[PDB]
Subunit: 124 residues, 4 copies
């Protein structure tokens, strides 16, 4: 199963586990997900976080919903060689979710050489 390729862990001391944080404002839920909170993850042409996806499984429901996907596509690559463009997209993803439901939020991130990583938090 695919779960055997997905890693998780303590974000407070790592650099791969996506950290999920949110702030509820009325019917709006602003979610921030990032890799490399405590320890910045490298962002080079050879080693970088490709994307972060956010999912939401409402409490008591059977099917998870993909809320969004953020792809970080600039990693220094240029005609002058790797790490020469001075253009890098940091692995920080923001999602504005409109819902009055509660449940669980899951984040799935992919490092180009270190596989898949996950994390989750309860959405009160």
């Amino acid at each position: 199963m695919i779960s055997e390729t997905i890693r998780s862990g303590d974000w407070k001391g790592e650099k791969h586990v996506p950290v999920i944080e949110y702030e509820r404002e009325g019917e709006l839920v602003k979610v921030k997900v990032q890799v490399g909170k405590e320890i910045p993850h490298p962002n080079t042409t050879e080693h970088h976080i490709r994307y972060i996806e956010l999912y939401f499984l409402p409490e008591g429901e059977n099917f998870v919903y993909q809320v969004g996907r953020v792809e970080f596509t600039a990693h220094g690559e240029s005609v002058n060689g790797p790490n020469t463009s001075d253009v890098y997209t940091e692995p920080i993803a923001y999602f504005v979710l409109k819902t009055k439901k509660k449940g669980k939020l899951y984040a799935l991130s992919y490092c180009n050489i270190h596989g898949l990583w996950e994390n989750e938090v309860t959405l009160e």
Copy 2:
């Protein structure tokens, strides 16, 4: 764990599990992944397969690689209402992978109302 939202077994009545098939030609591995092979999954504005992702974990290695992602973006929507454009993208994905390695291939797919689905096959 996000895996708690991923199903690997179809329920009788609707096909969701992405079926993986491949053909090895020299250094090339042609992979076909599809949802609803014989009995098609619905493809309406309201209910459809959004995408299929292909992953490869080489034998004996520790990090899975994302081979590709195919998004099926047309589902009949139009200014004249849902299911009126006569333009639909079928959930059939093809990937041309160049590798001489062996291992396991995983497929992850998403139904807009039925969550995540997975499958895997051994790449010999």
Copy 3:
């Protein structure tokens, strides 16, 4: 040319043109792109903004770089019918760009029934 399918205009009078705003903080450039600033764009199962992409062409250079892509994937769809999930992803995209270069930022957004839309701003 694909440009014949891309529309542009005044966001103060329309509701499809992606509005670009940024803030330069040290070596970081925080870019906010959104559709429906003045006039909120519908976000229903039948009619919604699918994604917003950000591009950067550094001053004096020949090749544009894709900075990122944000996909808004929840639009009310559920097993209970269209617009019944109470889960919607608003078309607001945030990008954290690390660069000391100046140039032009382009935004490309896609509405599921109203085609492609663009906008641009000078990154000073």
Copy 4:
């Protein structure tokens, strides 16, 4: 206009323009899009084709439809260095479109260091 960053003609020496080919079978239109058909475009960790998108504008209509998007995500990167994984995703995209309409098909591709490229063909 973003079109000022999109090229439609290759320069001798490197293939970038996505070549579109299709086959009509009943209500199904099988579309194949590829970069570097005759002369392969590089596919290294430092230089590679990131994705190909397919669009369809039905004859006489005003809004283009995105048919699909294929992301080629493996480019040799590994913990053992750039170009060491022996896993590369070739820039060949296949789309199965269900439609009885005619019109124009557009392809948009992106090289990580050579910007955006386009091409189009009439769907008879």
